[PDB]
Amino acid sequence: MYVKLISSDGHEFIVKREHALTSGTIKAMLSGPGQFAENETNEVNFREIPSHVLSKVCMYFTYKVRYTNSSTEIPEFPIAPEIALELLMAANFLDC
Amino acid sequence: PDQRSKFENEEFFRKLSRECEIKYTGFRDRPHEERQARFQNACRDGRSEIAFVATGTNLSLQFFPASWQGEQRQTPSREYVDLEREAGKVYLKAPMILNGVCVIWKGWIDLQRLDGMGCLEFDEERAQQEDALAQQAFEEARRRTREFEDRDRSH
Amino acid sequence: EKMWIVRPVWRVDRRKIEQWHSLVKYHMYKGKKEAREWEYVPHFKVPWGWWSHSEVHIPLGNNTKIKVTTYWNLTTEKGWLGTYGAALAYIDQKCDPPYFTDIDPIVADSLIHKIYFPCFTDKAIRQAILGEKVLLCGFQRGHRDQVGTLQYLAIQAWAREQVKKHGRGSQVTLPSRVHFPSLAYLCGTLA
Amino acid sequence: MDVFLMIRRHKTTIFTDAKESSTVFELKRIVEGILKRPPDEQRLYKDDQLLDDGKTLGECGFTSQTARPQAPATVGLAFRADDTFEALCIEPFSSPPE
C-alpha cells in the first residue's frame, strides 16, 4: 500500500505506507485504534513543509528502511547547508 | 531469541564476514620454510600463541594457552585447536559472544601454504544458557538515543 | 592435553595504544574531568596474564561496564618485536555469572556516548532555530553504530557550518583541540 | 541489486524501488497499480531518452551506485492523453533562499 503526502506548495509525494510510518506525526495519523479512521487514511496535507524539504524527508524514509538492520557500511546522508536548518524544522515537526 | 534474526544479515559484527579467508600472519619477512616450522611448533609448544588474521582486516582470532592467560568469562577447552586429525591441515573452533550474538567459528589452515577458510555458526544453546536475559537489556542500550535527552542548563 | 582459550582481538600499532592511553588519562585527571569516573589499571596489579598490557574500565548504567583489554608481546610480524592488540568487552554484573560479550568498536563508542561525553541538550533544537547558543556534541564518533534520527543528522550537518565559518555571526562555541578516547580509532587501521 | 527511483510527472513523485536488472515494462506495471493507467498509455523516460519496454533498468543506466536511497535517480513519466501523446513535463521543487 502507498500513501500520499502533499507539500505546502501542492507537490504530491507518494511513498510506501510502511516507510511513512517512520515519522511519529505521520504514524499517529495513519495507525491506531481506528476510532478516527486512521487505518483508512492514505493522504496527508502538510501546509508546514515545502517541497524541497519534503523531498529530502521522503528520501530519509527509504534511507532508514534499508540501512536499519544491516551492520554493513551505513552511507552518509547528504544534507546541504542551505537546506540544513530548514530540514531540522520538518524533522522536529514530524519525528517522535 | 531475536539474536537468530541478527545472524541472518551479512557482517553483523563489523570487519567479519559470515565466510572468510584466514592467514597466519607472523614472521612475514622470514623464509617460508622457517614459517612452516614456526607455526607448527607454536601449536605444539606449551606456552606459545597462534593468531589468525581475517584477510583485508586487522581483526584476528587469538588463541592463547589457558595456563598462561585468562579472561572474564571465557572457558578453556582442549579441542579448539586440532592438528593430528588430518595430515597437512589444522582445524579450529572458537565459541564467543559477538555483539550479544552467541556464535561458533570453525575453520582450517593448510600447513604448507599457511592459508585457510572459515565460517560462523549460531549457538542457540549458549543463548538459552546465558542467565537473567540481560542480552535483551544489552540490545536495549544499543538502540537507545542520547542525542536530545540531557537537560539544558543556563547559568 | 593442551587447552586453549579464544577471544577476538584487533591487531593495532603500538603507536595507537600510546595515543589512546594518553587521551584516557587526560580526561580523568587534568582536563574538564569528562572521564573522571573511568578507571586505569597498569600492567602490574592486573589479574595475571603474560600478554596483558593494561585494562580500562568504563562503567555504564545499572551496574554495567565496558572493559578494554590491551595485549602486548604477540606473535611477531617482521623483525623481532612483539605485536600489540586490543579486545573490547561489555560486562553486565547483575546476573549470577557476569554477562560478557565482545563488541566491535563502533558499538562500544556508541554505548560510551550514551552516558559520558557531551551531546546536544534538551533545548538543542529550539535554541538552534531561534539563534541561541548550544553544546555541539564533541563526540561525533558515538553516533555511528545505529542510523540516527533525521533530527540529529539535520542538526549535526548544521553544526559543521557553524564550525566551518567564522563571522564575516558565530552563534555557537567551538570544540576542544584535545580529542576524546575513541575505540574505533584505537582498533581501526583507518589510514 | 537494488535501484531507488523517483518516478516524476508534473507535480507527482513516486518513491519506489526495483531490481537493477529488471525490465522497463514491469516498471510501468508499478505505475499502473498506483496511478491507475494502463502501460499502453504511458512513456517512461531516463534523462533525455525514451525507454524501450524490453530494456533492463541496468542497461538504461540505473546502476546500484547511481540510484541510492539518499540520492535516487529521476525517471520521467508522460501519461499519454487519450488519442494523442503529451510532452514530458516535471515541475521543479521550491527553492530555499539561503
**What method was applied to determine this entry?**
X-ray
Contact at 8 Å (CB) between B89 and B110? yes
Binding residues of C for Zn(2+): 113, 119, 137, 143
On whether both C51 and C86 belong to a single domain, the answer is yes
Task: Tell me the CATH number at D19.
Answer: 3.10.20.90
Which residue from C124, C130, C24 is spatially nearest to C70, judged by alpha carbons? C24
On whether both C107 and C183 belong to a single domain, the answer is yes
Q: What is A1-96's CATH number, 3.30.930.10, 1.10.287.3510, 3.30.710.10, 1.10.1200.10?
A: 3.30.710.10
H helix runs in C13-165, sequence order: 14-25, 105-113, 124-130, 150-164
Contact at 8 Å (CB) between B111 and B36? yes
Contact at 8 Å (CB) between D22 and D53? no
Give me Rg for the CA atoms of chain B: 19
Q: Which residue reads 537507545 in cell numbers?
A: B144
- The cell for B67 is 595456563
Q: Which residue reads 580523568 in cell numbers?
A: C28
Q: Judge: D15–A76 Cβ closer than 8 Å, yes or no.
A: no
Q: How many domains does chain C have?
A: 2
Task: Provide CB contacts within 8 A for C139, sequence distance 6+.
Answer: C109, C113, C116, C117, C118, C119, C180
CA gap A72, A74 in Å, rounded: 6
Contact at 8 Å (CB) between C102 and B103? no
- Domain of residue B29: give its range: 1-155
* B89-97: long-range pairs with CB below 8 Å, 24+: B90/B43, B92/B52, B92/B61, B92/B63, B92/B118, B93/C6, B94/B61, B94/B63, B94/C6, B95/B123, B95/B126, B95/C6, B96/C6, B96/C7, B96/C8, B96/C102, B97/B126, B97/B130, B97/C100, B97/C101, B97/C102
Query: Taking CB atoms and an 8 Å cutoff, what residues of chain A touch D3?
Result: none
* CA-based nearest distance A22→chain C, Å: 10
On whether both C125 and C106 belong to a single domain, the answer is no
CA gap C130, A62 in Å, rounded: 30
On whether both C109 and C142 belong to a single domain, the answer is no
Task: Provide CB contacts within 8 A for D83, sequence distance 6+.
Answer: none
* CA-based nearest distance C154→chain B, Å: 12
Q: Is D87 exposed, middle or buried (0-12, 13-18, 19+ CB in 10 A)?
A: exposed
- Domain of residue D52: give its range: 1-98
Task: Provide CB contacts within 8 A for B93, sequence distance 6+.
Answer: B77, B79, B80, B81, B82, B104, B105, B106, C6
- The cell for B85 is 586429525
Q: Which residue reads 530494456 in cell numbers?
A: D55
* Termini Cα distance of chain D: 37
Contact at 8 Å (CB) between A40 and A74? no
**C149 touches A: beta carbon within 8 Å:** yes
Residue among B25, B74, B138 minimizing CB distance to C5 = B74
Contact at 8 Å (CB) between C1 and C96? no
Which residue from C18, C51, C52, C25 is spatially nearest to C39, judged by alpha carbons? C25
Q: Interior CA angle at B125 toward B123 and B128, to 5°?
A: 120
Q: How many CB atoms lie within 10 A of CB B67?
A: 13
Interface of C with B in 131-190 (CB under 8 A): 137, 142-143, 145-146, 148-149, 151-152, 187-189
Task: Transcribe D66-97 into DSSP letters.
Answer: TSBTTBPEEEEE--PBTTB-----B---PPP-
On whether both C113 and C25 belong to a single domain, the answer is yes
Contact at 8 Å (CB) between B67 and B48? no
Distances (CA, A) of D56 to B94, C160, C171, D23, D48: 45, 41, 51, 4, 17
Contact at 8 Å (CB) between B100 and B139? yes
Task: Tell me the CATH number at B64.
Answer: 2.40.250.10
CA gap C124, C120 in Å, rounded: 6
Residue among B50, B60, B77 minimizing CB distance to C3 = B77
Q: Over D31-64, what HEC string results?
A: HHHHHCCCHHHCCEEECCEECCCCCEHHHHCCCC
* CA-based nearest distance C166→chain B, Å: 24
User: Which chains have at least 3 CB atom pairs separated by less than 8 Å from chain B?
Assistant: A, C
Q: How many domains does chain D have?
A: 1
- Domain of residue C168: give its range: 118-178
* CA-based nearest distance C9→chain B, Å: 5
CA contacts within 13 A on the Cβ side of B13: 30
CA gap D45, D51 in Å, rounded: 6
Strand bridging mode B89-98 / B81-82: antiparallel
